[PDB]
Symmetry: D2
């Protein structure tokens, strides 16, 4: 929940996910990608389920980064959808979609799909 999700996370690519979870389900923070058309930190915002099920399952969440900041614009956005899994070694397991702006002729090739797993080390 709030304290478990709040903090600094790293995925398998070395990217840095700094996030604050609110009591009301909000996610806010910054994202630093180690790959792609990206430099420094980007704003992120998202939502999480603030009252998850009581059977040991994960906590559903998602967030968005638009890849524009003061240093670069990649004309694109990524959303991550996944679940937070608490425990001795907490994890956030996600799938993501990255859309970049295209003409309509090229819309068919506008979206990349992948998967990221975040840990606290």
């Amino acid at each position: 929940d709030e304290a478990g999700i709040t903090g600094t996370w790293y995925n398998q690519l070395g990217s840095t996910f700094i996030v604050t979870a609110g009591a009301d389900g909000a996610l806010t923070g910054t994202y630093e990608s180690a790959v792609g058309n990206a430099e420094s930190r980007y704003v992120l915002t998202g939502r999480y389920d603030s009252a998850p099920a009581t059977d040991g399952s994960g906590t559903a969440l998602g967030w968005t980064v638009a890849w524009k900041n003061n240093y670069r614009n990649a004309h694109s956005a990524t959303t991550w959808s996944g679940q937070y899994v608490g425990g001795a070694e907490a994890r956030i397991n996600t799938q993501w979609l990255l859309t970049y702006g295209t003409t309509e002729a090229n819309a068919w090739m506008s979206t990349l799909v992948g998967h990221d797993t975040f840990t606290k080390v």
Copy 2:
């Protein structure tokens, strides 16, 4: 495209997407799904490219809904990733990922994928 994106949108399922695009690149609003384990409106937040290319390319954006509100909690979240296409028939074309909370044994089946197209036509 603050003026363009801001407003009330409907997808091909009849779901209602009410959104304000702010100066900073923020999207805020509410989502009401016509389908699924959902009732009434849900908070949404997201981001968009506030300085898109002017060469006919769409405007990249995305947003998230956690499916908990005052009526129901479906223990799930959807993110939409897409682009806004201006013109006489403005459109937001998206693909989405819906994840629901699972045990680790069942996490292989935790995520649905699909696509929604939105217009301002009621």
Copy 3:
């Protein structure tokens, strides 16, 4: 069903899907893409549910194309996963994944996602 799926199908991009459905679940045929790094016809192979439910549901199916023929090699492959929906205007509704060969450091950007709907027209 066999005769339902067998034939020539077109998607919203203008691509041509020529398929034969065998009695025990086989799909074989050729694909011609109207877009991308492709020219002429490519071999496809797939599988479909040869005993679908008779409760109004679609018929699940999928197929793969590797983008190599005698004209060209694009070092990539696409898989389509969807369902055949019968009736007056038959349709095949799919989502697809296109993976191209990358180095391990670039594997994160290796796979595109999209959706194609096939009908008998165009």
Copy 4:
């Protein structure tokens, strides 16, 4: 080039068993046994791979499909995997997959699951 490398018996992180033969000009044929889901024993699979991959260290593109009907069960669904075979000291197949099951048109929006499987020859 990767004909012999791809050919063999593979396992993913769920414990599923992927037995495949790669033909010299791009065909994949074999069987798939899922450790999870509405599945029992082996299912037929067919697919394609790039039989002439690029040189500068790129992986080899491939994909395959399983329809989840065999002599034991019919789950009225199909999965496609799309990914890359990577060589090296320990060969791996990294995939993303789409599982579609038959629905009514009213429910077509919830018809497709997405996930990812990584295969190796160990276990």
